[PDB]
Nucleic acid binder design. Structure first.
Lengths: 94, 263, 266, 94, 272, 267
DNA sequence: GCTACTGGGGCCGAGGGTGTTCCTAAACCGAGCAGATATGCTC
DNA sequence: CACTGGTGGTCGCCGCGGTTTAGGAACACTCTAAGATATTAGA
DNA sequence: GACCACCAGTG
DNA sequence: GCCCCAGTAGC
């Protein structure tokens, strides 16, 4: 049971309702909750199955060095990058 | 996508809804009030949803709540349970057939009754007593326990019918979560051993085993304070009691421990 | 002793279940008139209606069109424990189990089951005759049959006839499960099928499965329409409405269980 | 040490850079991190002193019933509501 | 609003940056690529930022890093330390006066050296030995520890060469230099942040980072070097990234950042 | 100890030399051994090669404000040479050398030697009295209203114009002084009159020249009463430091103040 | 609502007697019946 | 990129052999020289 | 009668 | 030369 945040963008309303089934949507396309690893894998299954055009980013609490991890689906100007193991986000130009 | 349920220990205890129509929007369980305020509800992340008078649930909402394993419970006056809707085939055949097997055999039924008696009260049940005799003993001790807590919290008590309001609200919440757990594990709520006949007999047994631990005395406290809004304080205290005691996580091992007396 | 409601609000007027549709036609329903209310899509029930149904014991069941699916039901798990313990008594005793299975065989096919056969032997005869019936339907309706092939993951990557058969069987499990719930029995307690939460549904549905339900799947298979699953679902809906199969399944259930020679409840 | 999420809306770039000092901006106005109680309350002081016109919501992991808690600054169409202790979000009409 | 550093224990150990100009945008530490790709660096949440060849830091960037107490370390080949921008006047008077007090007295100096020996090898140092003698004993122990770890992990081992002009299929020495360089980085950051002087050493002396070498060498072979040997046996395509990743994991598990300062206080506790 | 100030340009390496390319293209070629300390003013960007060269020849880099008004960062953090830090530390820990250094600070600040039979706290008292009289004298001379020195550190705007000017002046002075202490290679935390705080030595040396030019200029700006007084005081201290060469002159003053201990210098 | 772009202005948010003390998949197994260089279908 | 308005189309996203096993702030202090000769403005 | 897909129009 | 801010388009 760790903390979860799912940020959606350009996502069709099916995935938005489906995410609202389990997670609290505190801002447009920003969902937050507290789920286990299995439930998180199921929610990511929903994300991969229902977005189809938009981009989604999912982050959850862990025991890594930064204390959390995140994962992306689809393309966004903000793209994750690897720095010798540590994952950050970089903003691509136009 | 499948949209399968979440384990019961992972979700929130209970949510109360009032005076609004309940719709499904883009797949979500939404509550709309008379003014137009849409309010999404994490239907999949709550054990049971309580519907108060004034709610108007739609078909897709009942289907949706059913698919995510979230028991709907219509309650009326003082939160007393009126009706309920859940999964139509959400009974596990091995658990259901084991329970019914224990219920058919008179010997195993006596074993289960004695187990419930020995779990509700610290002392073992009196030996060589029939089912009805143990039922009467447990009933007399229930009356003496209600009167005992009544003297401890200093509220006038003429019998189990303000104090009946608080007791009915808290015990009604416990019956809600207990019914949700019973349906979730696959057992039947109508097949009871101590209580019989009523369609929620097993819920009355399992929940009555543990209601006097923390649920009833808190309702006596709220009954003595007697605030202007008793139901809300009772609900709050019920959620804190369910979270602290982790009742939802230890309801199923209580059922399996009771039915384990059948060897 | 039951009624389907759709496309309207279910409210209470003078102690009666009133159904107010879109055109304003109110359907007043006295309490003693129906034992179950089958709620179809497009229905919104009020709190007073659920309160009335509770205080008179009416069974509410949220279903699809004509009971094609069973989405939810009031008194979940079973309201009457006597009927549940009755069915369980019939299923735990091996002798009564074989009696009920034999009655299922004699009601599914005209001839009684071969004498002194166990449950697994009758299951083998049942499966073999089901194979021959698949072949017979294939030749009669003139469709190429390769077997009961279906991948549980990719529905689209499957044979069209197996899609039609699958949709037809799903609708049949719908009406059947609705009938078992209306009668007041547990869908999981089965005699031929056992273990899964809808075993009884599989048995009772299997009694009549190849009577115009699966043959309708082969019929829709001949035409090869654009969306065979929808055509099969709607065809099954129409057959359930005309043939009144839901209403006629309850006596079948009561007799199948009645073959146990044990006093049924009332 | 618990997980932290900050969603900003219509805040001046000062607050966005200040949040970029400690947290990872995974989407426009969406920051994620893992901080202590002191660092969290400091970050909130930054939000209060630096937003001045927009709305911010901060959700951090806890050991409550929902597993997390959140607070808000400013006004948003999505407003928290109290349901018998459980805090949800309502979407107000125009 | 003021901007203050967060405790070192709550931080990521290290970040390596290369081939881009480091600017400050809206008060943020930003790494801009030659292609225009901006990459924000959570400078306040890192203990060291290693700057590889290709980086062009701005005045505002160096100021900002020093303000949130994040050490800047310009780094050469195999991660070796070249330079370091840090917090000016960031040393505590009581701490620095205690350290210098211990270094000025010869007896207290030998006390601190013996404490470093006992903490490094577990067993107390031989009695009636000077600083040069404990330095030679320490040298032999280090040599035999390198050889022993080499035979354990099964790595070709000859010399422990520091000069990179000796590595022309010699990856083990590169891994040792990179790992120990990461440790030297976080240890220097811990010493500066704690308020001590990295130049005032006891075992190592005259070097500009003698105290860093002492404290880091106390806990070097506990976790950091064996990991370098593990990376060395599994011949990698990019040894630097593997060694950095492994050192990061080691720092998280062994809780090195949180245990550095109390180790320093335990070392300097030799003289009352 | 030579030094050079650089602003508004890119610092790169050409042919093993520090080249500085400014906004207009003026390349400043700087031989590698021509300067011991580079003061990086606002607007400068350092390439990795430059830091590598300065590192390999031991050049101290300091990121400062204009003319040393603030000290933001510095290379060789904490101190690169242990001999100087232990020299200053030995002077501070021994009370006799401490009182010698303090007496040199007194004699250099005013001109007259302090009285012989005096302790450290007594010299602190004489200093306090004389700076009180100096506050009153400067206030009466420039004709600004004086009601004391105190202020509110929790809010800068809740204070006198004169206290704001004085505080800004002493701030810039602490900048240039700290820059000097770092360029000489000594510890800004090891003080003799001031003790305990991480910039005690900066306060010590700063007190020597505090009331010669910067505080008089603070009373001048306070008398003129501009719109933004802190910016005017800071720019005025910037111009004073540039024209009077305050940074360069501060270092030999440090070397003398420490040399008063009659103990062999590091060299 | 976020992002980009372009002039215009500034190089900037401090102050310092000191030191103590306290606040869930797979493997395994039943049947019939067609039809057979046997397994294959079906339950 | 999110929210919303109207219209036309659906009533849905299925398949069922059964069972066992794999750290600040508060206070408490120096000292001086003027001068309310006590107390105070400065370090 | 309840719900969804679609196709834009605006800030 | 580096960086913030104000205003104004643009989607």
């Amino acid at each position: 049971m760790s903390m979860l945040v799912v940020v959606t963008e350009n996502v069709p309303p099916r995935l938005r309702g489906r995410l609202a089934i389990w997670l609290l949507e505190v801002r447009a396309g920003v969902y937050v909750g507290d789920v286990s690893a299995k439930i998180r894998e199921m929610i990511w299954e929903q994300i991969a199955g229902l977005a189809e055009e938009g981009n989604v980013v999912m982050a959850w609490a862990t025991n890594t060095e930064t204390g959390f991890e995140f994962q992306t689906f689809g393309l966004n100007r903000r793209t994750p990058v690897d720095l010798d193991g540590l994952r950050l986000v970089s903003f691509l130009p136009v | 996508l499948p949209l399968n349920p979440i384990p019961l220990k992972d979700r929130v205890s209970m949510i109360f809804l009032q005076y609004g129509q309940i719709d499904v929007i883009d797949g979500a369980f939404v509550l709309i009030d008379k003014t137009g305020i849409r309010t999404h509800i994490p239907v999949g992340s709550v054990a049971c949803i309580m519907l108060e008078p004034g709610t108007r649930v739609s078909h897709a909402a009942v289907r949706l709540a059913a698919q995510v394993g979230t028991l709907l419970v219509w309650v009326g006056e003082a939160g007393v349970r009126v009706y309920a809707s859940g999964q139509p085939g959400g009974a596990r055949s091995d658990k259901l057939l084991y329970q019914a097997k224990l219920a058919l055999d008179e010997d195993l039924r006596l074993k289960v009754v004695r187990k419930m008696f020995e779990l509700r009260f610290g002392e073992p049940a009196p030996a060589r007593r029939s089912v009805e005799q143990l039922r009467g003993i447990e009933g007399s001790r229930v009356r003496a326990t209600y009167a005992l807590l009544a003297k401890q919290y200093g509220v006038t008590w003429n019998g189990r019918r303000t104090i009946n309001q608080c007791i009915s609200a808290a015990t009604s919440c416990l019956y809600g979560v207990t019914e949700a757990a019973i349906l979730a594990a696959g057992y039947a709520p109508a097949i009871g051993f101590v209580h019989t006949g009523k369609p929620l007999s097993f819920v009355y047994d399992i929940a009555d085993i543990i209601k006097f631990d923390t649920v009833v005395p808190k309702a006596f406290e709220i009954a003595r304070r007697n605030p202007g809004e008793p139901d809300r304080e009772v609900r709050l205290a019920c959620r804190d009691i369910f979270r602290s005691s982790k009742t939802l996580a230890k309801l199923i091992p209580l059922i399996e421990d009771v039915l384990a007396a059948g060897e």
